[PDB]
Amino acid sequence: VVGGRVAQPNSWPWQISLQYKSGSSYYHTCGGSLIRQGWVMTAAHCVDSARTWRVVLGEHNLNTNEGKEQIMTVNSVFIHSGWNSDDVAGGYDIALLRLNTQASLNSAVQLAALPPSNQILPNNNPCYITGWGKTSTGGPLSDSLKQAWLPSVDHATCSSSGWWGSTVKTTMVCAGGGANSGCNGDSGGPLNCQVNGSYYVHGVTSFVSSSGCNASKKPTVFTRVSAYISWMNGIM
Numbered sequence: 356v357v358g359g360r361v362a363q364p365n366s367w368p369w370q371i372s373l374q375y376k377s378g379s380s381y382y383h384t385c386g387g388s389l390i391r392q393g394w395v396m397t398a399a400h401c402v403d404s405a406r407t408w409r410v411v412l413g414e415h416n417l418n419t420n421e422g423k424e425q426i427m428t429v430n431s432v433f434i435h436s437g438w439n440s441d442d443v444a445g446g447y448d449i450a451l452l453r454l455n456t457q458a459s460l461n462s463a464v465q466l467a468a469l470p471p472s473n474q475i476l477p478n479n480n481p482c483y484i485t486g487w488g489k490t491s492t493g494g495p496l497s498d499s500l501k502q503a504w505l506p507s508v509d510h511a512t513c514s515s516s517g518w519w520g521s522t523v524k525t526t527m528v529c530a531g532g533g534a535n536s537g538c539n540g541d542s543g544g545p546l547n548c549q550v551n552g553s554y555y556v557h558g559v560t561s562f563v564s565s566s567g568c569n570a571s572k573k574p575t576v577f578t579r580v581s582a583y584i585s586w587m588n589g590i591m
C-alpha cells in the first residue's frame with residue numbers, strides 16, 4: 356500500500372495473508388478476504404500456479420507470532436473459468452480457496468460482508484484498501500498491515516481516455532487515482548467500502564499502472580465483487 360498508514364492491529368478482521376512455501380520459509384505474496392469459515396476470496400493471478408500455500412488469519416505483523424493468528428492450509432483452489440493470465444485487463448481476476456479446516460471466529464477473525472449482486476457504488480464512495488504490499492513502486496513490503504483512504508471512481512471517469520480508457524471493464528471497480536494506491540503484494544486483498552454505515556468488500560485488488568503503482572490518473576483497479584456473487588454461490 357502506497358501512502359496511507361499502518362492500521363491499528365486487527366482492525367480489518369477479514370483480511371488474510373496468502374503465503375507460499377520456499378524451502379523452510381513462507382513468503383507473503385497476496386492478500387485476500389475471509390468470506391465463510393472455510394472459504395477465502397482472492398485474485399486468480401495469485402493462485403494460478405501450483406504452489407504450497409499458507410493462509411494466515413488474524414494477522415498484523417508478518418514476522419512475529421502475536422498470538423491472534425490462525426494458520427490454515429488450502430484444500431482446493433477454484434479459479435474463474437473466464438480468467439486469462441495473459442490478459443489481466445480482460446477481467447475475471449477472482450478465485451476461491453477452500454481451506455482444510457474452518458476458522459474460529461472471534462474479535463480478531465471475522466467474515467467479510469459481501470455486497471448484493473450487481474450493486475454499483477456511487478462516485479467518490481468512501482473506501483479503504485488494506486494490505487502488506489510494497490510501500491512504493493519497487494519499494495519494500497510492509498511488515499505491518501497498512502490501510503489507505505482510496506475513494507471509488509465511477510466507471511464513466513475511470514474509462515475516460517485520460518484515465519484507464521478501454522482497459523477497465525464494467526466488471527471492475529476503480530479507486531484512487533492519486534498519491535494513494537495498492538502496489539505489489541496487495542493483489543487479491545479487499546477494497547473495503549462503507550455503505551450505510553457498514554464495511555463491505557467491493558473489490559479484489561487486481562492491477563495498477565505498469566509505469567508506477569500510484570501513477571497519476573491510474574487508479575488501482577479491482578475485480579468488482581458484486582459481479583460474481585452468483586458464480587461464488589454456485590461454487591460454495
Ligand SMILES: [Ca+2]
Nearest residue numbers: 416419420421
Ligand atoms: Ca504476526
